[PDB]
Amino acid sequence: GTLDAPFPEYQTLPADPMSVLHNWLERARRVGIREPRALALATADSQGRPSTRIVVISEISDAGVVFSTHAGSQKGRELLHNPWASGVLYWRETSQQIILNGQAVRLPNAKADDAWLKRPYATHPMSSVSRQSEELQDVQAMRNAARQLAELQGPLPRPEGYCVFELRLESLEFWGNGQERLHERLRYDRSDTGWNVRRLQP
Amino acid sequence: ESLTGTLDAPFPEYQTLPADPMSVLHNWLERARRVGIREPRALALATADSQGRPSTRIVVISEISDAGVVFSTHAGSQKGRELLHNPWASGVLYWRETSQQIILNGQAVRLPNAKADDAWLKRPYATHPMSSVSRQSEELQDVQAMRNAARQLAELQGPLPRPEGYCVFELRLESLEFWGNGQERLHERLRYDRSDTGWNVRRLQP
Ligand SMILES: Cc1cc2nc3c(=O)[nH]c(=O)nc-3n(C[C@H](O)[C@H](O)[C@H](O)COP(=O)(O)O)c2cc1C
Ligand SMILES: Cc1cc2nc3c(=O)[nH]c(=O)nc-3n(C[C@H](O)[C@H](O)[C@H](O)COP(=O)(O)O)c2cc1C
Ligand SMILES: O=C(O)[C@@H]1CC=CC2=Nc3ccccc3N[C@H]21
């Protein structure tokens, strides 16, 4: 759109999409894309009905990307029975998308403890009182209970349901606007020995 | 905290619980237009394959209908193939400037070809050549060949026939959520689910 949007990988077909992912994200940070790690994450229920919401990617790992949430949320309950998920990053400023597909696996509690402690302590009170995605019966009661905890010197204990998922990637697509509406689509699929890569028609 | 929004985003509906969620959708979209949100109708649309594995991509909401939202695509694309077997979908709008999300869940129905003809004609004609030559989401074997083919069609400098497979879907909504940042991190989540008659409305915990 409004900012420079280089996509040399569409020509060169790099072998490792995780390198491409790292490079796109680092560039997004450098050029000042607004909230580049806001991932629209899709899960599905036992009938195959998708649900979506934004989550923040907290880190990139060897196998994929990592985010935190509550296990009893809708996404948590869906992932418990159906680990397959997909997320899209969309950067308006550069007209670029990254699509991330794979299986999300809940990481151990020590990882969750560390993630919880790395959040700003001001987030701990509400995340402790709320049972994410359950019906809220009394707004003021929640507000007041969190205010009681906000008086404390953080950090608070990690709540039982606070968890970290790693989305272990099986495929990725990098999308750019291209020239003459020939949008540039670079698609990776995991193989037994590495990754296959192809271009897709726009 | 990753949230960067700083624009006031009134959410009286979280207090008043309107019976009819499409009015809330209209209110929020109209405000987004008035305050200048960038691409508010860029919808991250999720579909699922035959085994329930999701896929996602951005599409644009072209219209708000009585039942839901409308978008166009190619029937042979991944999303089109997925929807034709499993009509259930979900999409999310996220507006950074106001820290608002809208989650839209329902069943997508392919509209008649007359509707697709009209939508096709409403697109700028400069978009017609590439959309005609491209079989969306199939492997692209020769970039230059596609480029050259589209350039030849573009010489017409006018509208082309609607391609087989260019289609319009209406996502007929079964549930919605309106999410606002709220105060003191008590994010404001207003959730609607269709009932036998009308809608049920609830607040959700953040
Ligand atoms: C910009 C943004 C970032 C968010 N990041 C997270 C996150 O990382 N983890 C989380 O659980 N919820 C996050 N949320 C809240 C989710 O969108 C959602 O409301 C919540 O996770 C419940 O989703 P569910 O009911 O579909 O499970 C974020 C919301 C916004 C607007
Ligand atoms: C801002 C933006 C808007 C888009 N709008 C549409 C659209 O309305 N319809 C469409 O078919 N593809 C649209 N695309 C392209 C899709 O994201 C996607 O690449 C294409 O539809 C193929 O998706 P699929 O392979 O998952 O079916 C848009 C892409 C961007 C970046
Ligand atoms: O950037 C952030 O902190 C996110 C902004 C809005 C809501 C969030 N909810 C979370 C819930 C659990 C774990 C992380 C979250 N991130 C924030």
Curated annotation (Swiss-Prot), chain A:
Summary of the function given for this chain in its UniProt record: Involved in the biosynthesis of the antibiotic phenazine, a nitrogen-containing heterocyclic molecule having important roles in virulence, competition and biological control. Catalyzes several oxidations in the terminal steps of core phenazine biosynthesis. It oxidizes both hexahydrophenazine-1,6-dicarboxylic acid (HHPDC) and tetrahydrophenazine-1-carboxylic acid (THPCA) and thereby contributes to the generation of both phenazine-1,6-dicarboxylic acid (PDC) and phenazine-1-carboxylic acid (PCA). It synthesizes phenazines in their reduced form, which are the likely end products in vivo.
A Gene Ontology biological process term: phenazine biosynthetic process
Subunit structure: Homodimer.
Cofactor(s) annotated in UniProt: FMN
Keyword Oxidoreductase listed: yes
InterPro entries membership: Phenazine_biosynth_oxidase, Pyridox_Oxase, Pyridox_Oxase_CS, Pyridox_Oxase_N, Pyridoxamine_oxidase_dimer_C, Split_barrel_FMN-bd
Residues binding FMN: R53, I54, V55, V56, S68, T69, Q74, K75, Q97, Q132, S133, R185
MF terms in GO: FMN binding; pyridoxamine phosphate oxidase activity
Gene3D superfamilies on file: Electron Transport, Fmn-binding Protein, Chain A
Family from the record: Belongs to the pyridoxamine 5'-phosphate oxidase family.
Catalytic activity: (1R,6R)-1,4,5,5a,6,9-hexahydrophenazine-1,6-dicarboxylate + O2 = (1R,10aS)-1,4,10,10a-tetrahydrophenazine-1,6-dicarboxylate + H2O2; (1R,10aS)-1,4,10,10a-tetrahydrophenazine-1,6-dicarboxylate + O2 = (5aS)-5,5a-dihydrophenazine-1,6-dicarboxylate + H2O2; (1R,10aS)-1,4,10,10a-tetrahydrophenazine-1-carboxylate + O2 = (10aS)-10,10a-dihydrophenazine-1-carboxylate + H2O2; (1R)-1,4,5,10-tetrahydrophenazine-1-carboxylate + O2 = (10aS)-10,10a-dihydrophenazine-1-carboxylate + H2O2
Note on cofactor: Binds 1 FMN per subunit.
Source domain of life: Bacteria
EC top class named in words: oxidoreductase
Keyword set includes Ribonucleoprotein: no
Pathway where it operates: Antibiotic biosynthesis; phenazine biosynthesis
Residues the record lists as binding substrate: H70, R119, S127
Organism: Pseudomonas fluorescens
EC number: 1.10.3.16
Protein name: Dihydrophenazinedicarboxylate synthase
Record's keyword terms, sorted: Antibiotic biosynthesis, Flavoprotein, FMN, Oxidoreductase, Virulence
